[PDB]
Symmetry: C2
Subunit: 112 residues, 2 copies
Amino acid sequence: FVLPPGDKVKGEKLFKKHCKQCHSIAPTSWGPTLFNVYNRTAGMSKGNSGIIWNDVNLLKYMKNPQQFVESHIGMNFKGLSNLQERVDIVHYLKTLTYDDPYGKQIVEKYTK
Amino acid sequence: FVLPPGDKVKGEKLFKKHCKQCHSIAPDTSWGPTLFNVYNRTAGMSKGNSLYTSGIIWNDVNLLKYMKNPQQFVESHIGMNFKGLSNLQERVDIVHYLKTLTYDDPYGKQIVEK
Ligand code: HEC
Ligand code: HEC
């Protein structure tokens, strides 16, 4: 499969419209810069040089990002309904700080 | 609103089950950002739709809401979210545009400026 014919001017305009809001194009934004993203190793490769942002992968991601993530990583986070579970997770996250004994031990581990 | 009573041990268990796959807990790599010291941190999506702005804080209520429905949280606080682009030709044109964002492409060469 090769990339079908297209219009890079329409492409730049569609990028302004649909992607610029969260993506820079400089070598500051919420999402990663999309400069030199073509054939670049995708960040979701770290989830658990995997996935390359080639033509097919760019077309599939843009069609349905959540489905793409689920299909290539195997899982995805769509939310936790149980309020108590989220409360417990927040209780855990509050200890992940430099002034809590648990977070102190974390700094110990990842610093050695 | 006050954070209701909770269990930090069950919290660690649930974190392992549901968040560790994409999130590290190291001081600062994983796909997502490290969640160490995320409490009261300025959320990354504060940079969305970038006159200085303090941004969104990951406090109790916001963490709970986001964990409930992340994409709904994003839509509510940013105003927009990316759920996909159905039209195939728009995607092909975007790919054509992105292929020019390199250090060796003319347009990419011009954009590269420091
Ligand atoms: C915010 C409202 C966004 C909009 C609009 C678009 N994207 Fe995005 N994208 C966003 C974030 C926060 C992230 C990082 C987290 C993640 O899910 O990966 C991304 C990621 C990408 C990537 C991956 C880059 C990598 O190095 O792996 C790509 C290729 C990408 N986004 C492209 C893209 C396009 C083409 C968009 C419009 C058509 C678009 N994004 C919109 C947040 C947001
Ligand atoms: C991948 C499959 C993920 C899983 C499972 C979970 N998260 Fe996530 N999260 C992921 C990415 C790629 C990103 C960055 C892009 C984005 O959409 O923001 C995030 C972001 C967060 C954040 C925001 C961090 C910040 O703004 O500094 C938080 C607070 C967060 N994630 C928490 C979180 C929790 C509590 C999860 C399980 C209960 C969880 N994430 C799962 C990818 C993935």
